[PDB]
Paper text:
In OXPHOS, the protein complexes of the electron transport chain (ETC) establish a proton motive force (PMF) across a biomembrane that drives the synthesis of adenosine triphosphate (ATP) by ATP synthase. The reliance on the PMF and ATP homeostasis thus highlights the importance of the mycobacterial proton-pumping cytochrome bcc-aa3 supercomplex, which consists of a bcc menaquinol reductase (complex III, CIII) and an aa3 oxidase (complex IV, CIV) that are tightly associated. M. tuberculosis cytochrome bcc forms a dimeric assembly with endogenous menaquinone/menaquinol bound at the quinone/quinol-binding pockets. MK/MKH2 are part of the Q-cycle hypothesis and essential for electron transfer in the cytochrome bcc complex.
We observe that close to the Qp-binding pocket within the membrane of each QcrB of cytochrome bcc there is density for Q203. All of the Q203 molecules fill each QcrB subunit binding deeply into the QP pocket and with identical binding modes. In addition, the carbon atoms of Q203 make hydrophobic interactions with QcrBGly175, QcrBAla179, QcrBLeu180, QcrBThr184, QcrBSer304, QcrBPro306, QcrBMet310, QcrBAla317, and QcrBMet342. Continuous density is observed between the head of Q203, a likely bridging water molecule, and the side chain of QcrBTyr164. After addition of Q203, the turnover number of the hybrid supercomplex reduces to 5.8 ± 2.4 e-s–1 from 23.3 ± 2.4 e-s–1 (mean ± SD, n = 4). The binding of Q203 involves residues from both QcrA and QcrB. Consistently, the mapping of reported mutations in Q203-resistant M. tuberculosis reveals that they are positioned directly where Q203 binds in this structure. The structure of apo cytochrome bcc is almost identical with the Q203-bound structure (rmsd of 0.50 Å for all Ca atoms), which suggests that Q203 binding does not significantly affect the overall architecture of cytochrome bcc. A comparison of the Q203-bound and Q203-free cytochrome bcc structures shows residues involved in the binding pocket move outward, thus adapting to the shape of Q203.
Author numbering:
A (entry chain I): 1 to 56, 69 to 79
B (entry chain G): 18 to 203
C (entry chain J): 13 to 157
D (entry chain F): 10 to 561
E (entry chain N): 276 to 495
F (entry chain H): 1 to 139
G (entry chain D): 25 to 100
Write the structure that this text describes.
Amino acid sequence: MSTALTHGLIGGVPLVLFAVLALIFLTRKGPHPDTYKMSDPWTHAPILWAAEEPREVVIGGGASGKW
Amino acid sequence: SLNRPNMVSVGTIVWLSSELMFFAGLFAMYFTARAQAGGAWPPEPTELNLALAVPVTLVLIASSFTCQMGVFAAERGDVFGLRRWYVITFLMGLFFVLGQGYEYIHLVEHGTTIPGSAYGSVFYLATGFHGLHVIGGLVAFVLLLARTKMSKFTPAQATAAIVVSYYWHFVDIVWIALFATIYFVR
Amino acid sequence: ELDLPYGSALTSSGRISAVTEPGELSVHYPFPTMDLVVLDDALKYGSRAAKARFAVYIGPLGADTAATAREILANVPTPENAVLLAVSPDQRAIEVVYGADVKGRGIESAAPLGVSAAAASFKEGNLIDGLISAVRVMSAGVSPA
Amino acid sequence: ELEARRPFPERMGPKGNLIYKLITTTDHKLIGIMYCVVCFAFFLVGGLMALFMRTELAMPGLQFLSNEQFNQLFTMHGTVMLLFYATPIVFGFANLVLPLQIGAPDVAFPRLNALSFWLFLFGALIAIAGFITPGGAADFGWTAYSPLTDAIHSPGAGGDLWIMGLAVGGLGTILGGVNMITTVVCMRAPGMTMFRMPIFTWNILVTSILVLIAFPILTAALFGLAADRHLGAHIYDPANGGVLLWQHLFWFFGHPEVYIIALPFFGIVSEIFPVFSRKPIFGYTTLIYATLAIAALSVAVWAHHMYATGAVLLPFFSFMTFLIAVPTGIKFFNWIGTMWKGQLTFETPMLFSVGFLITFLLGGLSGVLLASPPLDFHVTDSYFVIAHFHYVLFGTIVFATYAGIYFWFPKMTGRLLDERLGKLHFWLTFIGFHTTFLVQHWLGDEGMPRRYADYLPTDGFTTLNVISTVGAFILGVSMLPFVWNVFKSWRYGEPVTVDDPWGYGNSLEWATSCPPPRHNFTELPRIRSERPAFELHYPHMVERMRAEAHVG
Amino acid sequence: VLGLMGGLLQINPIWNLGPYKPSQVSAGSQPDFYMMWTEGLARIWPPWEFYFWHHTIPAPVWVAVIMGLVFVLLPAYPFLEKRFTGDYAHHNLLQRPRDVPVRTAIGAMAIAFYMVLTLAAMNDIIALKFHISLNATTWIGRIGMVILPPFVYFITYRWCIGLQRSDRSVLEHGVETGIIKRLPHGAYIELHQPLGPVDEHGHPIPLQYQGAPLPKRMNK
Amino acid sequence: MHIEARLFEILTAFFALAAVVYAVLTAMFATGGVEWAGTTALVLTTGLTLITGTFFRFVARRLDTRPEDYEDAEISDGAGELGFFAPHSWWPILISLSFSTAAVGAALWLPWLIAAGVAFVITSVCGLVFEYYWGPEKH
Amino acid sequence: HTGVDVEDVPSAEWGWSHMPIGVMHIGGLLSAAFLLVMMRGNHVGHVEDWFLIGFAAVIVALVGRNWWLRRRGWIR
Ligand code: HEA
Ligand code: HEA
Ligand SMILES: CCc1nc2ccc(Cl)cn2c1C(=O)NCc1ccc(N2CCC(c3ccc(OC(F)(F)F)cc3)CC2)cc1
Ligand SMILES: [Cu+2]
């Protein structure tokens, strides 16, 4: 049945359907919290991040600055 | 903790059941093609010499008792009785398989072959696989004896001895069945 | 005898066994993932080349800021050989604390540099970005010993 | 009190961390991961063969294939998809989550495990390596009918490799079954009796029993066939009862095989449903009895595949298949009851489970329709049969496997798969599948038998083949989101820092750290029912679980 | 051993052959296994010739220069390695092959190359006994000659580092005994066995690596 | 263990019933008499389940209650020392390689390859069995 | 030695344990070029050049991925 249109459907329907389904589903919002922007206050709990690299209370110095 | 029912025993038992199913397949091969050949279904060029099929069956049956005496001596902690009984068992199993090979030679000499007949095919294929199982059992005996030689005797060695023993008992009784089916019922 | 907020339970050991409803997460960090990764390899590879743990703090310092920073530094596993960087985005204050064991290795010649870089990057509204810059410069400054 | 952490867990791991641990490993978790990865590679190979078949079957005329190549294609497709993807994925899921579910540190025999995996891999590689032979791979059917696989007919060197690869794989499967039975029987937690273990474990035990019953007879048949091919052994000549003997043996093997690859996935979905329904599993002992009944009945119906030979006792097998149709019905009703009046949330595992429900119902309806002899007198060896077993096979293995992957990915990795990609994947798969296999009922009811490489334009059914090949290409494109999701989410992706990322879990595996430690446990809870983790995380619920457990 | 295998196995039965005559030939024309690489290199090298004014440079010239390059690169290796690594000290203690990953990978790559060249010499025997096309074997060799050495290099490097890590793990902890306990609050431990001193709470203090092999099985 | 034995007894009873029924229903009403190929498989699957069930029954009758078989129990009951579970080993892959060599040597009829495969299987199995029993070297 | 770190290669001071990355990159490119030129003198067939081009494309893709990921700091 009109070999050109057989090849055309076989090559075109799957990719078109992929396009509509991707634009439907891949444009939503994920569960990740949206970025914090410093203009507004900070409400998240305190954060402490270590380095963990070298395996296994007297202060030596310090510095400061207030932007 | 150690949950007294042994683990190696359960493993060996379930595997022995599977091997029984294998021999079921072989038996089903044999029984068909016997309902087809009518009359003297063992063709004329074959004659089963019974004067040599009985001695090998009896030496296998005696080897069973020898293996049982070996495991008896094993369950109490002395290795030399185990070694003596298992050497005896190995010797007479070797004698059994040698006699079987002699019968194969004298049978193919003036008669049945695998490509020559259908009875020849089913006969050789039903007995050769049992021969292979017997040879595997002999190799197991050798390996177990060497392992008893190379270190101290502990309960693990006793468990190995027990499981090898009743694998050999299984092969013995399945041979009893094969023999009673092939030679007497016909 | 604590609250264990609706799903946590104390086991036969000291371990807590928490749960989460099917549709949430268990981190809640208000930053993108591809910047957390960059801050992480900064914090790791700069700590390799200096033989000193680098830490970062972001909560508030609602007191004498240096006091509270050296109060916090006692939470790093080996605080005596460690370098902490504290930041309070409300009070807009930067604080860098050292350990007694990490000193004589070119540290105070590098702490004000890190503070200035962090401030210069914060003045536009880049938190993680300034943290990365400060950690980079301080780690490049300190020498192994 | 503050407590130090990392900005993000480590992505990959050190250099040299895996390759040597891969060769000498003995822990079940790594072996389950290896199972899953290699089985999915083989799935991709089989799917490629199927796409070649489809693109030839459209457009009457032999455009680019031959008759020999088409026969080899469908033979190898069937063989790969049934024996090198499903039977090992069963043991993959078993090795993954059986010792965790029974509360054990390891499997019974830890080196027999690795032996089984390597036997599987090398047997598969041996059987596939017939395409590099100039004559090609095996060209008979998947079923290897009686005189066509002889030495006179089919004389190539691909059938030999086929037979030997199957033998090696079968040995591996038997060893795996032995190990699983021994592990479930001996190694078990000091509190849980056998009527408190989860249903997945019971299904695995029963499946292992079936494996032990079924596979040795296939090895026996294959050794007979190799003897007949290499020694002229007169075992399967039509002069003897050699044509029906092979069929009896093969189908006595081959029906327990489909039930072997069917039951554990029933277990998987029955284990996913209560977590997302927020309810107990409806009819525990009823499900156990239904499983036992299906197991017992699956070995005495083998001859409903041989109606058209005119050599079997039809009423016996017809009646007993009608009988085996019942326990599956009670199982289905128990699932629907477990979903009844709960609080449903449709994350990807629940979505895939519902798809499984729908597809398997349609396939089973077509099968029970197929089970009557006067109807099989027309629709046998046509595309109706193909549509039927593709419905049941797909709906079971594919959907329940994707459900199990999306369910147990955190418990083995510590990460979470993306959900938008999961929904896209599910919808692509569903649409493509239902559009590629639905018209084949009509396509086969009117005369078009299976295993044809060509047909004439004067015949009908040239548009239905085009619709089917469009659907096949949609199904083929539907695999990119899944592999992209797995490739990205293994290294990046939201980490899991808690137990039980799907709240309201059961089965004692959601009571240990999300990536479990070596030996799987740092402490055990007190076991009183079949939902120990649920009673551990919600202690204020045991009174209500014991009070209203019998209303119905 | 030499007497036994010279009595029981047959080698070079010249009588089955005939005297040499320039007009007749047979099918297996291989040399002994130490020239098979030369033969295989001649088989799988493409036909590249150059024809310029009144002259001709045939294909086996390539085999000649490659052979010479191999024979020149073999004796000059220590000087290359000392130029590249920059180490000129006296050494009387050997290295374990797992401590030098790059040299081990180089050697494995060279051995893989040699094996490919040697197997490409028995094309006829392989294609006859194992049913494979002859052109297929030629192309398999021609492509393997390029893609097998680097694959072997990569795998050997990663394998050496894996062995090093396995050594460091048994240095840090003890030797695994394979015994499991249940620790009344339902925990599973595995009863390691220390190789040196122990601290106050029973854990062994980690040792330092000294270039010597370490035990891995308790029965050794 | 009491429930495993009961499971196997149920299975054995059903299989024996089905085998006898099939045999006597194909002795009559069939084209050529007894079918002889399903009958055998059925009696011997009955025998399989019978062997397993009888072993479990004996072990259950020769045993006192076990914390697994016992309800009412606590985790302090199983406190003890389990068996020996083998850590890392590399012999399985060599066993599989040897068996695959023998299998491919049986596919293409090559007797020398079959002999080599059998020798390698014997060697690898010996290595696996002796792995945790070799003593220290004697020097 | 030229230098790698001990947490990557534990035995880094006992033997040669580092090879520069440009060597590997340009070696992969040269091997791809060799595979590509090996189809000169087309001897009556094209089943072979499909394989040649496939392997060359795979090699080039691997080299390109490694180079691009190293250039953006995703590796070390
Ligand atoms: C993985 C699985 C799988 C499963 C589960 C099944 C399930 C069933 N199959 Fe199928 N089958 C195959 C795989 C499978 N099959 C394959 C691969 C082939 C042929 C391959 C080959 O020839 O090459 C095949 C072929 C095949 C045939 C013969 C085709 C032939 O003519 O050649 C028959 C019928 O005899 C059959 C019947 C059944 C029946 C009765 C079930 C029953 O199990 C299903 C019952 C299911 C239900 C869902 C019922 C739902 C229940 C309720 C809702 C209560 C409803 C009650 C009433 C309507 C009474 N199958
Ligand atoms: C568990 C099993 C299983 C599965 C999953 C499938 C999957 C599919 N099958 Fe198959 N099939 C059988 C079991 C199975 N089949 C059996 C038993 C037979 C008959 C056996 C015989 O007659 O002998 C059969 C026969 C059969 C036929 C007819 C053969 C004949 O003519 O009689 C057809 C097509 O009509 C078909 C189609 C498909 C399609 C379209 C899929 C789709 O599901 C698959 C879609 C898959 C993919 C496209 C993979 C994606 C691939 C790519 C992404 C290419 C990528 C490549 C590389 C990376 C290598 N199958
Ligand atoms: C292709 C090889 C081969 N095909 C078959 C087919 C069938 C059989 Cl049965 C055997 N074979 C073989 C074979 O036997 N191969 C071994 C071999 C190869 C080359 C050389 N040559 C000697 C000296 C030359 C030389 C001389 C002077 C030189 O000096 C200069 F010019 F200045 F460089 C350089 C090189 C080169 C190598 C000997 C044995
Ligand atoms: Cu049929």
